[PDB]
Design a protein that fits this description.
By secondary structure, the protein is mainly alpha-helical. 72% of the residues lie in helices and 0% in strands. The structure holds platinum (II) ion (2 copies). The site of one platinum (II) ion has 2 residues, from loops. It holds the Pfam family Serum_albumin.
Length: 543
């Protein structure tokens, strides 16, 4: 039996949570209580199988069990079609109510009143809103969500304790979710071959000192971990993640110097810690690449005898000595390299043909460096909010077909690059910026996927995972596009209206001038300012 093998390895507590997540991600509209029942059933039944591994129905695969309980058009179908069904019925942008915390004391009452139902409530509410959230991590998040209610519902000021943590958790969760979503899209839309390269790139950067052989292994195991979490095999995802976190730490010496602190801590902490570690120190005298990948007489041979292992050895070798480069860059270079080997090793003298393959890189490297230098100059020259509006406008013109809420949402997140990254030294900027941008752009891509309007966005999204940022950056304003025919709010709130309006304002006269925007923007802000001052406000808002 299988249920048991998991229940055992994961423990009831975590089992129970995961199983919840699994469900709330699959059916996002279905009410809270409705799930908890299904959970508890599954949980009781598991226990039976723990007692009698040869009991009735314990012979089944988790998918079948889960799908079944859930089913109490997809349900008219059977494994595996059925599961793929639910997997493809996942909604990235549910019409689910805005999430809002009732007054502190109200929560602090409920937390002591019913501590379990309370956490299950949290997992439930997040999971249905982030159907691709990294299940294991969501546990970390939940424990740290408990830890704040434990403390802050037990102090002088609750509000100035609790809320400040919850603002940090929402932020962090939003990032993790978005980051994970990229992982899942990479896998599902570009296949594992592609994710593998990504991993090989990133891990070679986290763990420079590690021999290729080790990195390949890690990449395998990790790819397995994610594949599962994205295919909705969360239980196994978490176990496998654990087993991996346990592996890494045993062999620490051969991986990184940095892991010690991480490896010392509990199951949940360390998996996150590790995920988040700093890059190990760049090893000393590493023979220049060119020797083995340009000067060698056996390039054209090794690319024949093992293109994958060779190109991997390459990606590895280049990545480990470039923590300054984005992953997506490194991938591009890798692609350029593959490409060029292809053409050259079909020539008269290949040694000659490919000999200059590094010259090809200068462009691909520079194109990003400039772009970052410039909008970091810009960022510091504008500050984050204003900075967001420039991106807003820039992009809105590029893709005036995209829904306003999406435009706002994405723009704003593009905005944070500046504050996130521009404070770092150049050395650490690009991998910060570009790879963050690659996440944000993926949010666009998926939100867009749902309800497609703009062949340009689609082109960029589907054509190549790695070249998206350049594809988008490239885009000039859309000429084809046919122009489109409260006071008691927080700053962040006011911002999102103003911005929302800004988009409509651009959609109205795309061939606007920054000045005749300044003019309309201001006008309207003044309008709202006056109509806030009061009388019969609504009578004022008459226009
Ligand atoms: Pt959220
Ligand atoms: Pt090698």
């Amino acid at each position: 039996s299988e249920v048991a093998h998991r229940f055992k390895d994961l423990g009831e507590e975590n089992f129970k949570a995961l199983v919840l997540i699994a469900f709330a991600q699959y059916l996002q509209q279905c009410p809270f209580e409705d799930h908890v029942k299904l959970v508890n059933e599954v949980t009781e039944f598991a226990k039976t199988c723990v007692a009698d591994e040869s009991a009735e129905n314990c012979d089944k695969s988790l998918h079948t069990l889960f799908g079944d309980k859930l089913c109490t058009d997809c349900c008219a179908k059977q494994e595996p079609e059925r599961n793929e069904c639910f997997l493809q019925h996942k909604d990235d942008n549910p019409n689910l109510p805005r999430l809002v915390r009732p007054e502190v004391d109200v929560m602090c009452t409920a937390f002591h009143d019913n501590e379990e139902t309370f956490l299950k409530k949290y997992l439930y509410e997040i999971a249905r809103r982030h159907p691709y959230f990294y299940a294991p991590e969501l546990l970390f998040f939940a424990k740290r969500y408990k830890a704040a209610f434990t403390e802050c519902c037990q102090a002088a000021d609750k509000a100035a304790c609790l809320l400040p943590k919850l603002d940090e958790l929402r932020d962090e969760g939003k990032a993790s979710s978005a980051k994970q979503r990229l992982k899942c899209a990479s896998l599902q839309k570009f296949g594992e071959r592609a994710f593998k390269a990504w991993a090989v790139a990133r891990l070679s950067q986290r763990f420079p000192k590690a021999e290729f052989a080790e990195v390949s292994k890690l990449v395998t195991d990790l790819t397995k971990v994610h594949t599962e979490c994205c295919h909705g095999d969360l239980l196994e995802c978490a176990d496998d993640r654990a087993d991996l976190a346990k592996y890494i730490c045993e062999n620490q010496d051969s991986i990184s110097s940095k892991l010690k602190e991480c490896c010392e801590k509990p199951l949940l902490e360390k998996s996150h810690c590790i995920a988040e570690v700093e890059n190990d120190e760049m090893p000393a005298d590493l023979p220049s690449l060119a020797a083995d990948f340009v000067e060698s007489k056996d390039v054209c041979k090794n690319y024949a005898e093992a293109k994958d292992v060779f190109l991997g050895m390459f990606l590895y070798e280049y990545a480990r000595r470039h923590p300054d480069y984005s992953v997506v860059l490194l991938l591009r270079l890798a692609k350029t390299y593959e490409t060029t080997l292809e053409k050259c090793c079909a020539a008269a003298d290949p040694h000659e043909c490919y000999a200059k393959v590094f010259d090809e890189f200068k462009p691909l490297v520079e194109e990003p460096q400039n772009l970052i230098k410039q909008n970091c100059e810009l960022f510091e020259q504008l500050g984050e909010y204003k900075f967001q509006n420039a991106l807003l406008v820039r992009y809105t013109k590029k893709v005036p077909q995209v829904s306003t809420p999406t435009l706002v949402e994405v723009s704003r997140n593009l905005g944070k690059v500046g504050s996130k990254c521009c404070k770092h030294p150049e050395a650490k900027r690009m991998p910060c910026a570009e790879d963050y941008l690659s996440v944000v752009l993926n949010q666009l891509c998926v939100l867009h996927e749902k309800t497609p309007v703009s062949d340009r966005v689609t082109k960029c999204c589907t054509e190549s995972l790695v070249n998206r940022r350049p594809c988008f950056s490239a885009l000039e304003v859309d000429e084809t596009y046919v122009p489109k025919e409260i006071c008691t709010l927080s700053e962040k709130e006011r911002q999102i209206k103003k911005q929302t309006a800004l988009v409509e304002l651009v959609k109205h006269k795309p061939k606007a001038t920054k000045e005749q925007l300044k003019a309309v923007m201001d006008d309207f802000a003044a309008f709202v300012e006056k109509c806030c001052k009061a009388d019969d406000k609504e009578t004022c808002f008459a226009e």
